[PDB]
């Protein structure tokens, strides 16, 4: 009436089938796994059989027995007489994979019972924390085993099928007549060329030394998006709070100094342009800023999936100074912490089908180099971020280092990696009085 169900007749039938069907090892391997059994003697038999079918092909009854014997383990798993009882029975030929399907299905049910029992016990006696992390633990186990199982459409496919999807993309792009912006527009027209817009399943990075324009540039990207893109955007301001971000953004959008907003020393034209940018931003309701500090990728995925289901689907994410992201499991090793972060953000971008602007600092290696243009290496930690990304674009503004420069008011965006587009060195104009980058219709580069 109540039990973790397991079909054991079908089980042993599959066993004896694998015994007296020595060709067919992979077909049942599509669905059966070593731990997938309900009973452990069968796990022993199957792991021996698998180890041999990798190396030693001919085994039905007896050479498997010798393999079991070479480590001195006769009768520890029942007995060879029982093994011959297995080989004798089940003369079935037609169906083994379906028996394997139902056995694995019952095993999945069984593991669901295991997980539910773990939840109930770790609701009764989970031994010490705040239950804010317990709700997250439930969601974590849930979505983890979701990702561990759900992908069973997976398999190598045919070019006559892959080209269908490829040509579908080429059709819907060749269909839609538009300029060379297949993605999210940045507003900067000389950067859309090297980028074709922030493509919808990537981990963009925007890095530079501390006071160079990371947050500034990134807010300008999301501003231009929100004004153009008619879908939400997220702003994970882990560093500094919303009430600075938004002054800075009002100035970016309306070209007035920050001082003349955090002082009230402003004139009618400025009052007006503020009213205008405000009355624009209110009507759309695009932006969603999180002013929380020490987030984890778990929480980022949670909040993003929340804004997704309700408000259509997001179109862009910005994450300020990535390195503040945490995962307390890996708090003893920092490089692996950043690696987990980067993988989580890439998987997020692949999940919701958006880009993920992810800022990052740089190390003090480019200081003892005399060029000061950052290279892809000079990223603050772990070097996975120079691998997991479809796009890096550093920033370099020469007037910070060179007062002898004739290149001031000019900030150039040193692309440093782009898997599906060109390297380059874009050039733009910096006016930090109102925290904006603008286009530089000037000489070439």
């Amino acid at each position: 009436l109540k039990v973790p169900p397991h079909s054991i007749e079908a089980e042993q039938s599959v066993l004896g089938g694998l015994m007296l069907d020595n060709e067919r090892w992979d077909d049942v391997a599509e669905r059966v796994v070593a731990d997938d059994f309900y009973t452990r003697p069968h796990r022993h038999i199957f792991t021996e059989m698998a180890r041999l079918q990798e190396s030693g092909s001919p085994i039905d009854l007896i050479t498997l027995a010798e393999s079991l014997e070479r480590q001195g383990q006769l009768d520890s798993v029942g007995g060879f007489a029982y093994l011959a009882e297995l080989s004798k029975n089940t003369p079935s030929a037609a169906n083994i994979s379906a028996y394997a399907d139902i056995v694995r299905e019952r095993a999945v049910v069984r593991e669901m019972i295991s997980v539910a029992n773990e939840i109930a016990e770790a609701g009764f006696d989970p031994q010490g924390r705040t239950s804010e992390d317990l709700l997250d633990l439930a969601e974590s186990r849930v979505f983890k085993i979701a990702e561990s199982r759900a992908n069973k459409d997976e398999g190598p496919k045919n070019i006559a099928d892959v080209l269908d999807a490829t040509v579908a993309r080429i059709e819907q792009l060749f269909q839609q007549p538009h300029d060379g912006v297949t993605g999210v527009n940045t507003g900067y027209d000389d950067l859309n060329k090297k980028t074709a817009g922030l493509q919808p399943s990537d981990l963009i990075i925007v890095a530079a030394r501390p006071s160079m324009g990371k947050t500034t540039f990134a807010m300008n990207l999301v501003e231009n998006a929100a004004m153009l893109q008619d879908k939400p955007v997220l702003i994970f301001s882990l560093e500094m709070p919303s009430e600075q971000i938004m002054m800075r953004s009002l100035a970016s959008l309306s070209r007035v100094d920050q001082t003349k907003i955090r002082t009230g020393q402003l004139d009618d034209e400025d009052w007006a342009r503020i009213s205008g940018t405000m009355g624009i931003l209110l009507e759309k309701r695009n932006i969603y800023i999180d002013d929380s500090s020490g987030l984890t990728p778990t929480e980022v995925r949670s909040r993003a999936r929340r804004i997704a289901r309700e408000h259509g689907g997001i179109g862009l994410i910005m994450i300020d100074y990535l390195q503040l992201m945490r995962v307390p499991a890996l708090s003893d090793n920092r490089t692996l912490e950043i690696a987990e972060i980067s993988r989580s953000l890439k998987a997020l971008a692949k999940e919701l089908n958006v880009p993920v602007v992810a800022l990052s600092q740089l190390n003090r290696s480019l200081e003892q180099r005399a060029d000061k243009r950052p290279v892809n290496s000079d990223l603050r930690e772990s070097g996975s971020i120079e691998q997991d990304a479809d796009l890096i674009m550093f920033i370099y503004r020469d007037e910070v280092y060179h007062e002898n420069s004739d290149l001031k008011g000019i900030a150039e965006i040193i692309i440093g990696k782009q898997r599906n587009g060109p390297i380059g060195t874009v050039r733009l104009t910096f006016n930090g009085q109102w925290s904006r980058f603008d286009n530089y219709a000037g000489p070439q580069y």
């Binding site: 006559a160 099928d161 080209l163 269908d164 040509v167 080429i170 059709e171 060749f174």
Partner: protein, 49 residues
């Protein structure tokens, strides 16, 4: 799901008639590719110099 016929038909739906490929085979492909490779290398080294 789809074969050469249906796929190339949907391909002609993109691009019109008389688009004949001028390869038709596996060897002329690599041959003309090497031809264009050397021709490109010529102007490439020219641009370097």
């Amino acid at each position: 799901m789809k074969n050469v016929g249906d796929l190339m038909q949907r391909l002609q739906k993109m691009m019109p008639a008389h688009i004949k490929p001028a390869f038709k085979t596996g060897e002329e492909l690599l041959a003309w590719q090497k031809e264009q490779g050397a021709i490109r290398s010529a102007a490439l080294e020219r641009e370097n110099r």
